[PDB]
Design an enzyme around this catalytic site. Structure first.
Site, mmCIF file in Angstrom:
data_model
loop_
_atom_site.group_PDB
_atom_site.id
_atom_site.type_symbol
_atom_site.label_atom_id
_atom_site.label_comp_id
_atom_site.label_asym_id
_atom_site.label_seq_id
_atom_site.Cartn_x
_atom_site.Cartn_y
_atom_site.Cartn_z
ATOM 1 N N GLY A 51 -4.130 -6.291 8.404
ATOM 2 C CA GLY A 51 -4.617 -5.496 7.290
ATOM 3 C C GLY A 51 -4.409 -6.149 5.937
ATOM 4 N N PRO A 52 -4.815 -5.483 4.843
ATOM 5 C CA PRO A 52 -4.674 -6.003 3.481
ATOM 6 C C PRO A 52 -3.213 -6.234 3.107
ATOM 7 C CG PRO A 52 -6.244 -4.224 3.548
ATOM 8 C CD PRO A 52 -5.437 -4.150 4.812
ATOM 9 N N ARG A 53 -2.998 -7.056 2.087
ATOM 10 C CA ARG A 53 -1.655 -7.368 1.635
ATOM 11 C C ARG A 53 -1.152 -6.360 0.605
ATOM 12 N NH1 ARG A 53 1.695 -10.585 3.596
ATOM 13 N NH2 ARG A 53 1.030 -9.968 5.705
ATOM 14 N N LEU A 54 -0.939 -5.128 1.050
ATOM 15 C CA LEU A 54 -0.418 -4.080 0.183
ATOM 16 C C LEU A 54 0.535 -3.218 0.979
ATOM 17 C CD1 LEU A 54 -3.324 -1.500 -0.349
ATOM 18 C CD2 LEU A 54 -3.844 -3.926 -0.098
#
Ligand SMILES: [Ca+2]
Ligand SMILES: [Cl-]
Lengths: 471, 117
Positions: free
Chosen positions: B32-35
């Site tokens: 998934g996204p880097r958050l």
């Protein structure tokens, strides 16, 4: 049949959303009859599932057909039909026949609902009375929409000789109790053919409730069709009227300035509406006042809302329905209740408005006024159409009533009302009470002419006068 | 009534549970996204909360499997294969979004659970 079976001189059906039978019985006598309303659409009266929080939507998960819900038992029900009919107000049952429950539990009358094993002992229904589980997910596939489960609710099989007989028995029981018709919930998820067979087995109305001999139950069906689907509202008009949802979307959009009021000249089928006598119209209903979107007008936007309700009641197109809401801030919020789930009855206070949280739109002056107007102009066509070629229009209904609207600019014009000479009380801004008008008045000359004034800053954007509100 | 409004453009927004895509992906496969996972959960549970109880499970079902609408358009079925993250494992987590451990949201079944999914 597409005949509402109203009493002479009555019009409109009011959706008394979540009211109890005792309270409806009173309202029929104390307000509905005197104001000349035609009927009441009640909330499902058959046993449904008791859901945590007692939300409004629990009524749409049937458990049996025993008449015992939060609105009252069968004695209360019969007391209501008896008293309402004697007051010339008809009762229309909300029939939930497409499904049962979406989980296991108990119902308002104590019956068991076994969603898992598809057993509803109080009907009785077993697994062989339902369609094989699947999910509704393709609106370009009529068999999917009709034969699969709607949001996980057990889908009944009306193609069954057994289920058909059960459903015809339930409905016939309602008719023996004096109801005048049925609001068919989720008709879109059922087959025209099956419905044709069921409806055709219904007995004639019970004459002991003041019904003509040979009267047939009124059938209006819920089919939300805005186009482009494998299913069409037109597939249901051969055996009943259909709720016209395009109406509220087109009016709502128009009256919020989305369209020019001058274009309502050709209002009706020209716009993609059913033929008027196949349609039951309304501005908003219990479902879309919650999730209808920007186009739907509700009590929360009263000015345009009342204008739209006025136009609906002034125009001769279709049978009319009025939403009577309870105030709410959340879409799952159920009606006013106490800790034990008992319902809180509305209170009729001083100015005949309601207390305890019921909005009571039907008691709004501009609403019962136009219900009075629709009764006065009965049997007339739209005449004397006028428009400023923009956001101001006006027309009369024969020579029995006139109505003006402004959704842009002030209206100060001499227009032909086609009404007999006299002084009329605007039924929007006020009413005729004891020799005077509590609001604006209009003096009609001999030429049927009159100076009409309706400013854009007024509380309302409609003016309405008729031959029964004349000094 | 009720279920009848659980359609994109009505009780359900178009392209529903938009942000839950990346949330089920990271929770299920670490993809998934880097958050902040906490962040993504918040956004996803927010979108889900904005949908009334009666349409909640139907909104996740659309996220998972998709829907063909009145326009003939298909919507949903966002839970597609990702490198190192097979669609089916994701699709198995999805119904868990309403449970107490996750967003803990009530549904048409009465509690924080989506039967028939
Ligand atoms: Ca069905
Ligand atoms: Cl309806």
């Amino acid at each position: 049949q597409k005949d509402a079976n109203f009493a002479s001189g009555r019009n409109s059906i009011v959706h008394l959303f979540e009211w109890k039978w005792n309270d409806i019985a009173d309202e029929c006598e104390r307000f509905l009859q005197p104001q000349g309303f035609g009927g009441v659409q009640i909330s499902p009266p058959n046993e449904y599932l008791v859901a945590d929080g007692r939300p409004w939507w629990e009524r749409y998960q049937p458990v049996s057909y025993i008449i015992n819900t939060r609105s009252g038992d069968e004695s209360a029900f019969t007391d209501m039909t008896r008293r309402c009919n004697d007051a010339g107000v008809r009762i229309y049952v909300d029939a939930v026949i497409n499904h049962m429950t979406g989980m296991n539990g108990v119902g308002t009358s104590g019956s068991s609902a076994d969603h898992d094993g598809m057993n509803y002992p109080a009907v009785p229904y077993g697994s062989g009375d339902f369609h094989s589980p699947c999910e509704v997910n393709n609106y370009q596939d009529a068999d999917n929409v009709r034969n699969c489960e709607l949001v996980g609710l057990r889908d009944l099989n009306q193609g069954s000789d057994y289920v058909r007989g059960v459903l015809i028995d339930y409905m016939n029981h309602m008719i023996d109790l004096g109801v005048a018709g049925f609001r068919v919930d989720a008709a879109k998820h059922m087959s025209p053919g099956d419905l044709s067979v069921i409806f055709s087995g219904l007995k004639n109305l019970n004459t002991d409730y003041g019904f003509a001999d040979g009267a047939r139950p009124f059938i209006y069906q819920e089919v939300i069709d805005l186009g482009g689907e494998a299913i069409s509202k037109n597939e249901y008009t051969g055996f009943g009227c259909v709720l016209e949802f395009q109406f509220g979307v087109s009016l709502g959009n128009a009256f919020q300035g989305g369209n020019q009021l001058k274009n309502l000249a050709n209002w009706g089928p020209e716009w993609g509406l059913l033929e008027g006598l196949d349609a039951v119209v309304f501005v908003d209903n219990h479902d879309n006042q919650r999730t209808g979107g920007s186009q739907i007008l509700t009590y929360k936007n009263p000015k345009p809302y009342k204008m739209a309700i006025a136009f609906m009641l002034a125009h001769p197109y279709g049978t009319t329905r009025i939403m009577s809401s309870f105030d709410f801030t959340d879409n799952d919020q159920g009606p006013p209740q106490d800790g034990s789930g008992n319902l809180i009855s509305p209170g009729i206070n001083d100015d005949n408005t309601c207390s305890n949280g019921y909005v009571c739109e039907h008691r709004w002056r501009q609403v019962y006024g136009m219900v009075g107007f629709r009764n006065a102009v009965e049997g007339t066509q739209v005449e004397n159409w006028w428009s400023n070629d923009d956001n101001q229009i006006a027309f009369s209904r024969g020579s029995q009533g006139f109505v003006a609207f402004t959704n842009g600019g002030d209206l100060n014009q001499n227009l032909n009302t086609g009404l007999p000479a006299g002084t009329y009380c605007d039924v929007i801004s006020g009413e005729l009470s004891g020799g005077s008008c509590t609001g604006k008045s209009v003096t009609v000359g001999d030429n049927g002419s009159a100076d009409i004034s309706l400013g854009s800053a007024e509380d309302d954007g409609v003016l309405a006068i008729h031959v029964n509100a004349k000094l | 009534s009720v279920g009848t409004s659980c359609i994109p453009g009505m009780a359900i927004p178009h392209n529903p549970l938009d942000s839950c895509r990346w949330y089920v992906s990271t929770r299920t496969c670490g993809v998934g996204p880097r958050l902040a996972t906490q962040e993504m959960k918040a956004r996803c549970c927010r979108q889900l909360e904005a949908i009334p109880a009666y349409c909640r499970c139907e909104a996740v079902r659309i996220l998972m499997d998709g829907v063909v609408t009145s326009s003939g358009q298909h919507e949903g079925r966002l839970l597609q294969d990702l490198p190192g993250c097979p669609r089916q494992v994701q699709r198995a987590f999805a119904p868990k979004l309403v449970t107490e451990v996750e967003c803990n949201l009530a549904t048409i079944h009465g509690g924080p659970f989506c039967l028939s999914l």
